[PDB]
Design a protein around this ligand. Structure first.
Ligand code: KAN
Ligand code: QUE
Ligand code: CL
Length: 296
């Protein structure tokens, strides 16, 4: 964690001409804390080394796709420096004014506004997924089969003395079932947002139109279907019906596939909670995942 004195000092070092008048905490994620500075900029500071690589990733991707997208995205204006601890010490982005398009907010909109929102997200995704990926930096590729095998290995290392025989057999089976299913690894890899959820979609209540996409730190080259299944959850997201509208504008050509990927992903969450948990020292996510795994 950081003091305001630390943030200001960090920025002053690299941007001595930049006058800081105001600084307040803007937000906080698992990877970075955000500061709003002079009410003009969002500055992200990594909470840890791992978070710093997401920050570093966001900056590189945003630089590459700048003015290629049909909706406003953060623009990099300030960058920090690498250390032995952080790949990037901080970054300052233009602030995009607006509020998040919550499930609540969306469902209260004129049926036309909802439909237009679905159209704007579709064409945003269409152009993003169309961006030319050759000449893209290292690390950017996220091969799904590589991910699952690596995860499987991790679950095995973590849970071998935590599960009983029948319970681990269930784990093996699930991972077996995933890996022997071609549709998961068959996609054309494209540049994807990879955390495309309602809290990263900023909305203009005056125009009743989406006015920005934020938080590219998870972006990668992978399965573009990821950017639909993330919006499709019923608890914290928009739901299968609204995403379906988005799918039509996208001109999507295998929607049951999208659906099959959604359901697999929802089941898979227990395992991510174990892994993401253990890695981020979230003993709460680990125990939840562990308890879920010891069940249905
Ligand atoms: N909270 C409970 C929910 O958790 C996940 O969904 C949420 C994601 O976790 C969020 O993203 C954060 O966590 C990810 C790792 O999980 C990170 O990669 C990402 N950078 C983070 O911003 C995203 N913004 C919203 C989405 N609804 C599960 O899928 C969902 O079933 C479950 O109900
Ligand atoms: O410009 C930004 C902005 O406005 C918001 C934002 C976030 C949550 C809110 O509830 C809100 O009202 C605004 O955050 C961002 C996060 C970024 O990574 C980059 C940005 O540029 C902004
Ligand atoms: Cl300067």
């Amino acid at each position: 964690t950081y003091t305001f004195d630390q943030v200001e000092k960090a920025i002053e070092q690299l941007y001595p001409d930049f006058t800081i008048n105001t600084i307040e905490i803007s937000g906080e994620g698992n990877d970075c804390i955000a500061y709003e500075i002079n009410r003009d900029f969002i500055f992200k500071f990594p909470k840890h080394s791992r978070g710093s690589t997401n920050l570093f990733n966001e900056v590189n991707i945003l630089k590459r796709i700048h003015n290629k997208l049909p909706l406003p995205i953060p623009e990099v204006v300030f960058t920090g420096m690498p250390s032995e601890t952080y790949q990037m010490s901080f970054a300052g982005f233009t602030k995009i004014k607006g509020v998040p398009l919550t499930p609540l907010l969306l469902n209260n909109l004129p049926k036309q506004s909802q439909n237009q929102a679905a159209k704007d997200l579709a064409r945003f995704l269409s152009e993003l997924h169309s961006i030319n990926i050759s000449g893209f930096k290292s690390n950017l590729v996220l091969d799904f089969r590589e991910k699952i095998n690596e995860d499987n290995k991790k679950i095995k290392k973590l849970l071998s003395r935590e599960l009983k025989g029948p319970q681990m057999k269930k784990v093996d089976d699930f991972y077996r079932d995933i890996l022997e299913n071609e549709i998961y690894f068959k996609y054309y890899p494209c540049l994807i947002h990879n955390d495309f959820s309602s809290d990263h979609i900023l909305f203009d209540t005056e125009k009743n139109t989406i006015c920005g996409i934020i938080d590219f730190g998870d972006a990668a080259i992978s399965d573009p279907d990821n950017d639909f299944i993330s919006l499709m959850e019923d608890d914290e997201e928009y739901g299968m019906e609204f995403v379906s509208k988005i799918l039509n504008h996208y001109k999507h050509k295998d929607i049951p596939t999208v659906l099959e990927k959604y359901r697999m992903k929802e089941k898979y969450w227990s395992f991510e909670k174990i892994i993401y948990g253990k890695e981020y020292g979230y003993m709460d996510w680990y125990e939840e995942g562990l308890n879920e795994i010891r069940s249905i």
